[PDB]
Amino acid sequence: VLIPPRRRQLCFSRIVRGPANLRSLNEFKEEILKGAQSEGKFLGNYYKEHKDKEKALEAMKNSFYDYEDIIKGTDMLTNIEFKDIKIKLDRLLEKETNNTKKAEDWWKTNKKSIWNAMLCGYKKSGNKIIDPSWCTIPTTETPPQFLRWIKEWGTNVCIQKQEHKEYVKSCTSEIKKY
Amino acid sequence: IRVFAIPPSFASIFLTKSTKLTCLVTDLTTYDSVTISWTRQNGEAVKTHTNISESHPNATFSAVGEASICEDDWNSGERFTCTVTHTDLPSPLKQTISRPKGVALHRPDVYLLPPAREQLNLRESATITCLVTGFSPADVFVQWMQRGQPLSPEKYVTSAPMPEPQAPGRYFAHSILTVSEEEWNTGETYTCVVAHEALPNRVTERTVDKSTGKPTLYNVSLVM
Amino acid sequence: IRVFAIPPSFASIFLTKSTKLTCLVTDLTTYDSVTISWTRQNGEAVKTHTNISESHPNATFSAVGEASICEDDWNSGERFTCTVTHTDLPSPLKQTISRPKGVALHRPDVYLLPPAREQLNLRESATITCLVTGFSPADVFVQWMQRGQPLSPEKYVTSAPMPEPQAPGRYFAHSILTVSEEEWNTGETYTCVVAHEALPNRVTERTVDKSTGKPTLYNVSLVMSDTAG
Amino acid sequence: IRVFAIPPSFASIFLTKSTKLTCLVTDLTTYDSVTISWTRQNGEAVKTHTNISESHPNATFSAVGEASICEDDWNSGERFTCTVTHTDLPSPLKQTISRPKGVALHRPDVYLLPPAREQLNLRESATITCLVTGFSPADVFVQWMQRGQPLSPEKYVTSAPMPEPQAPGRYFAHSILTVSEEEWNTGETYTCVVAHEALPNRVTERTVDKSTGKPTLYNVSLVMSDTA
Ligand SMILES: *[C@@H]1O[C@H](CO)[C@@H](O)[C@H](O)[C@H]1NC(C)=O
Ligand SMILES: *[C@@H]1O[C@H](CO)[C@@H](O)[C@H](O)[C@H]1NC(C)=O
Numbered sequence A: 001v002l003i004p005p006r007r008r009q010l011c012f013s014r015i016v017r018g019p020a021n022l023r024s025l026n027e028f029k030e031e032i033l034k035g036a037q038s039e040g041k042f043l044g045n046y047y048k049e050h051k052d053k054e055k056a057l058e059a060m061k062n063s064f065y066d067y068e069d070i071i072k073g074t075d076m077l078t079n080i081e082f083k084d085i086k087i088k089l090d091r092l093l094e095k096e097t098n099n100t101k102k103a104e105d106w107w108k109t110n111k112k113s114i115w116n117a118m119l120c121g122y123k124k125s126g127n128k129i130i131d132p133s134w135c136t137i138p139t140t141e142t143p144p145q146f147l148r149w150i151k152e153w154g155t156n157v158c159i160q161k162q163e164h165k166e167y168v169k170s171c172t173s174e175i176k177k178y
Numbered sequence B: 001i002r003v004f005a006i007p008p009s010f011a012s013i014f015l016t017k018s019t020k021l022t023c024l025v026t027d028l029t030t031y032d033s034v035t036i037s038w039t040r041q042n043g044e045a046v047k048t049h050t051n052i053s054e055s056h057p058n059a060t061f062s063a064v065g066e067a068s069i070c071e072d073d074w075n076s077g078e079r080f081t082c083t084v085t086h087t088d089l090p091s092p093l094k095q096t097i098s099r100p101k102g103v104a105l106h107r108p109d110v111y112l113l114p115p116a117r118e119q120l121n122l123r124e125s126a127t128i129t130c131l132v133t134g135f136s137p138a139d140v141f142v143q144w145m146q147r148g149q150p151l152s153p154e155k156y157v158t159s160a161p162m163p164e165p166q167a168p169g170r171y172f173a174h175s176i177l178t179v180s181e182e183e184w185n186t187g188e189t190y191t192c193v194v195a196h197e198a199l200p201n202r203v204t205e206r207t208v209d210k211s212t213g214k215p216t217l218y219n220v221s222l223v224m
Numbered sequence C: 001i002r003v004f005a006i007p008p009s010f011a012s013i014f015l016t017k018s019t020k021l022t023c024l025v026t027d028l029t030t031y032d033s034v035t036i037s038w039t040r041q042n043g044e045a046v047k048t049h050t051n052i053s054e055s056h057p058n059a060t061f062s063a064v065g066e067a068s069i070c071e072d073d074w075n076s077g078e079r080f081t082c083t084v085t086h087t088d089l090p091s092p093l094k095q096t097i098s099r100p101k102g103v104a105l106h107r108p109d110v111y112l113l114p115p116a117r118e119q120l121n122l123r124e125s126a127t128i129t130c131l132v133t134g135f136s137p138a139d140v141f142v143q144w145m146q147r148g149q150p151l152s153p154e155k156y157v158t159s160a161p162m163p164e165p166q167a168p169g170r171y172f173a174h175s176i177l178t179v180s181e182e183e184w185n186t187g188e189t190y191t192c193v194v195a196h197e198a199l200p201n202r203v204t205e206r207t208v209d210k211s212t213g214k215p216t217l218y219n220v221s222l223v224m225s226d227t228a229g
Numbered sequence D: 001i002r003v004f005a006i007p008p009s010f011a012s013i014f015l016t017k018s019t020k021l022t023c024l025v026t027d028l029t030t031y032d033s034v035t036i037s038w039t040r041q042n043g044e045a046v047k048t049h050t051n052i053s054e055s056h057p058n059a060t061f062s063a064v065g066e067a068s069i070c071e072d073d074w075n076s077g078e079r080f081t082c083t084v085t086h087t088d089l090p091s092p093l094k095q096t097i098s099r100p101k102g103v104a105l106h107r108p109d110v111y112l113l114p115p116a117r118e119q120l121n122l123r124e125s126a127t128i129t130c131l132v133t134g135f136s137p138a139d140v141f142v143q144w145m146q147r148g149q150p151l152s153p154e155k156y157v158t159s160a161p162m163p164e165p166q167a168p169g170r171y172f173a174h175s176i177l178t179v180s181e182e183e184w185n186t187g188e189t190y191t192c193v194v195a196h197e198a199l200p201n202r203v204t205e206r207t208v209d210k211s212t213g214k215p216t217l218y219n220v221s222l223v224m225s226d227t228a
Helices: A027-039 A041-046 A053-071 A086-095 A119-126 A150-170 A172-176 B010-016 B071-075 B181-186 C010-013 C071-075 C115-123 C182-185 D012-015 D071-075 D117-122
Strands: B038-041 B080-084 B096-097 B109-112 B127-135 B141-147 B156-158 B169-171 B173-180 B191-193 B201-210 C001-003 C023-025 C035-039 C079-087 C092-095 C107-115 C126-137 C141-146 C176-179 C193-196 D001-007 D022-025 D109-113 D125-135 D140-144 D156-158 D171-180 D190-195
Touching: A027 A119, A027 C023, A041 A053, A041 A119, A053 A086, A053 A119, A053 A150, A086 B173, B010 B141, B010 B191, B109 B191, B109 B201, B109 C115, B127 B141, B127 B181, B127 B191, B127 C126, B141 B156, B141 B173, B156 C182, B173 B181, B173 B191, C001 C079, C010 C141, C023 C079, C035 D171, C071 C176, C107 C193, C115 C126, C126 C141, C126 C182, C126 C193, C176 C182, D012 D140, D012 D190, D109 D190, D125 D140, D125 D190, D140 D156, D140 D171, D171 D190
Parallel strands: none
Antiparallel strands: B038 B080, B080 B096, B109 B127, B127 B169, B127 B173, B141 B191, B156 B173, B191 B201, C001 C023, C035 C079, C079 C092, C107 C126, C126 C176, C141 C193, D001 D022, D109 D125, D125 D171, D140 D190, D156 D171
């Protein structure tokens, strides 16, 4: 397992990531997960001109599924993201609601999978119109891309290998340093 | 067979507003027809006792006899004798209980410690504790009123009185009330009322609010 | 005649760092050299019991039998049985005791509350109450330490565990260290050592000083009248 | 041809929660009539032994027989020896494992220094450092717990106990732990558990928080005039 920069590109609010539990899921986890409209700095700051417009939104697709698997069984091994209490923040609050629904039963980024789809953050700073075909990946789609074991791997070659490839196609020791 | 009559605890006196008594007993013969009775040195008429407990299978039958007694008469400490007669034992089980005298009355000091910030930081609970210390009679009755409405005994748990470490005669007690941190931040003025004999009016209040205990962070000194 | 079996409590195992298996007898006629013994699952012989209580004036003798055992055997669920062998006793009596099992472990939350400001104004004493809440089972060993040295049990008194209203299995407790305000106005550690099974290392501490808390006290003192226009 | 005894140190005893005694044979090949038995002064070598190691091409096998004994009994210095009888060497070999009583017992004075404000200002990462000083036995074991849950030994690096020149009879050790600035500003409380023999309770904790070191008194005095 090679963790991509999901360690930082995930910009959870302080409340969920911190030790403090949440008062009510209908209002704080509600408003805090959307509180990560700050998950819109790809085209806001970094991908604004670094790459083509499509890839910036493709990176959001990666965060969304990442976000989904934080809520239920990712593979980060960290007290704030996996083996963490934020997943318990969900279970604790729903269980407080007479076990109304498991976090992996509903509210698994399925019942309210839509959120804002981070497009508000995309639009907040980048201010680039999302194509209708581009607007269905930041929201829910049936494929889960297999538990992050082969999606974060999906993202490795999308940039971390192909851009070094095109650099090579563009000293030879530095080329052989890839 | 000897009856273990219990005096009406101050908690019973103040919670029910009436002096209710019972005559629990260690018993040899499980069941007998005749029931409980209460007698006084004055020899006044016995009070009605009802709802006697059913036969105890393990032969340690315990019976309850309820009587109404004037608070002043019990306050004076005059001895009351429980008289229980049974078919097996013709001799009445004459046993007397009176509130102990000769103990100095010491006024409780009630100090309402707010929740530890280590707890409010979790934003999951806020255990307010009513620290009752310094009262000499063992009896005490702590009750919690939130926002002016009394709260059911379920919400709060009152620790049994125990001897104070430093002062031997005096006692202390605890009463923690747990409320979700959402309620605490609203500032609902959770008040603790302690009922004790030594108090001037038998009850004193101490109210803790989210604001209380906050020092003056900002000290603006505008001088022209 | 009748015998009492005393399983080692969490305080006994923790306070002495050893497991004491005492077996006392009540309602037994006094006689010299009363023999008592424990028995394990394999029935291995116990250490020669000592410190047997003398003959009480009430014609009742208490034969206390203590055997030192390794904590691993008792914490593995292995059960012990106390057997009494004496001429006075009509026949041997067997009482088996083991560690209770089936109770869900829960980590205590040691919150330490400083004394109320009202108590300080009285100038007589200060109560530093340590709140051990939300732990199961109902067996905790709360201890107080000042400057790394244990404080005498006379100063601090620990209330017995009691059920917590919010949840059935959970319990809570207390521990109040009465100290003179003079000892508290000057910063002093007053650590609350809480020992419990569920904790990662079986202990937890919470230090309190006059400094702990004390929000930043801004003292903006701005002179602005120097401007005249 | 010698047997090297491995006395599980206090760190191992605390981590594994039990005393697992092992003595390892070095530079010797396996022979018939191999004997292992933890013998004390009393001689009651009735411990179970399991998982006997097999011969190693470099003639280094453990022949390990594990046993469970009290911590305090071992602290008394029972001097367990695994008696080995081998064909090549008829004389049995003894390898005592015990605690030398000569070594003193000074409790560590564990101090938890929060991250320097020069780290937080740069705003990349904060390195909490735990300072353990004043312990005479060189058997400290430091664990870091965040939010009441132990952290993997990978996240922190505990310096080996080194001599303290200023205190001849005491050693010191540090164990830095580095977290992302976005995690330290979150307010998480990191507790430096230090496990040591000399401690009265065998364990001590120190808590470091976002607000452990704060300026308790801001004293600003703005003086705004109109002329020189
Ligand atoms: C608050 O400011 C006034 C201004 O003169 C000063 O006298 C007083 O000592 C200050 N109190 C505190 C607690 O800082
Ligand atoms: C607070 O400020 C006032 C005026 O600036 C000063 O007289 C007082 O001593 C200060 N108190 C402190 C620093 O505690």
